[PDB]
Design a protein around this ligand. Sequence first.
Ligand code: UDP
Ligand code: UDP
Ligand code: CL
Ligand code: MN
Ligand code: MN
Lengths: 256, 256
Amino acid sequence: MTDQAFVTLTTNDAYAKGALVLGSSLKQHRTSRRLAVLTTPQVSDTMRKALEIVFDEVITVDILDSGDSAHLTLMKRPELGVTLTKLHCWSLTQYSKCVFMDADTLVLANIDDLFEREELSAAPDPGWPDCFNSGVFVYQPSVETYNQLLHVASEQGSFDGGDQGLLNTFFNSWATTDIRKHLPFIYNLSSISIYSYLPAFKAFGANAKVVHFLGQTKPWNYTYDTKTKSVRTHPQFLNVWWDIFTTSVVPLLQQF
Amino acid sequence: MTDQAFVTLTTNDAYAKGALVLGSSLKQHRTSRRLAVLTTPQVSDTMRKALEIVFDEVITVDILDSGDSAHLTLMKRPELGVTLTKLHCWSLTQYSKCVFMDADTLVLANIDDLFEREELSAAPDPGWPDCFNSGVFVYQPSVETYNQLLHVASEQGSFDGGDQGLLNTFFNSWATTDIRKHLPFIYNLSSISIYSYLPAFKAFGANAKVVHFLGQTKPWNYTYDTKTKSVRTHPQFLNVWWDIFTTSVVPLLQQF
Ligand SMILES: O=c1ccn([C@@H]2O[C@H](COP(=O)(O)OP(=O)(O)O)[C@@H](O)[C@H]2O)c(=O)[nH]1
Ligand SMILES: O=c1ccn([C@@H]2O[C@H](COP(=O)(O)OP(=O)(O)O)[C@@H](O)[C@H]2O)c(=O)[nH]1
Ligand SMILES: [Cl-]
Ligand SMILES: [Mn+2]
Ligand SMILES: [Mn+2]
């Protein structure tokens, strides 16, 4: 499918590492879809070159440029900078349907069946499960939707200072409407829950399709021993991320 | 409705305090339904007498008695003692439909609209939101369902050593089937989430219909200053619980 894509985002080199691991994981599990990444000019040439290899499309978004439609909203609401760059995922009208995935996600199994879903399909957020987590969602690119999202960001901002609040407010029927728009939690399995509700993880965690490295500490904030093949609680997913980073991404960075 | 009920559970005097506050809160918000409480012989005469006043029906369940259908399962799986007592909520076939509520819940608004729901309707659990939280659920009493639940408890036990695992395993279509069986989170608002995902709470918490005092520390494990009318983070709900306990329940205990 040349008209459907996974779309991720990186505004810097650190999240580009995640993007590269995510992209690699999607290729590893043989996606039949395109891979697109929103980037900013702050992503360095080296990360960019690697992103150009891993991804089928590298889109450059610069909301610091006043030529960008979101720039005036960034001025008004700096807290929404990442959110606003993220919203440009809706501008990818070369694609008919996309799965947005946070750059701190990791694919463990083919998830092309997400493309059966409609906008807006997303997994519940742990913590407040009547909100969906915006780290993984199925959406339909549309300039109108983009404009409407931008408009809401401008007018209301986001109840949580990020995209999740914004997306939940805009797609507010999610909690009460259409169970098919609730992506199984295994398609956006928060790394925290992989020890928060541990019995549930024991019971259902082996079904994980997507791990989402929530919280302050991202996989690249860890040190990884390449000999023992383990990072420096429950490091299983961290080690998968780092195995991909070590195996696929680091050498890729070295050929550029 | 004489055939529909809120059903709670207390196996001891401490949770009887919760039961009494819950029951009082349900009366406070003018439920048109019956109030039933499952109790064990371990609930003391004083708590019982108060329970007999607050609740329309006090049911005594004794799974330590070998005459109980669950007793043999308790022997096999002691971890399920509370769960097994709880399952007897399905034996309440005097009622056509019930809302089970944990004794550590607190009603903040009329929730009689829960009786529009079918078995099994429950709110998502924070932590693993493809499980429902079993602190509040709409169910239909049935000896068959009771027997089937008991059978599963006997054969598999519970993936989390409690009722939640058991109920989720038995009612396992919940996550993927019928959005109407997802009770809004506000009908079972985990006290933890009232600081875990705090922006969401700020945004939606004022809509709270039911507060669920999750975690080790229950409202009765707090000290409450009756003069300042506050307990000894975000004590709002604790103070509501204690206002009811102080105002309604304590004097009630004193008249028995
Ligand atoms: O400084 C940042 C912050 C986030 N992001 C992107 O926006 C998403 C926001 O999710 P993040 O993982 O940062 O937040 P969390 O999921 O931990 O709550 C990331 O995955 C990245 O794709 C980015 O590129 N640069
Ligand atoms: O020792 C106990 C433990 C629990 N329960 C009942 O079973 C429910 C189990 O939920 P609990 O609040 O204890 O667990 P949590 O919701 O905190 O995970 C309680 O609300 C009570 O109704 C009880 O009566 N005695
Ligand atoms: Cl539905
Ligand atoms: Mn993320
Ligand atoms: Mn409880």
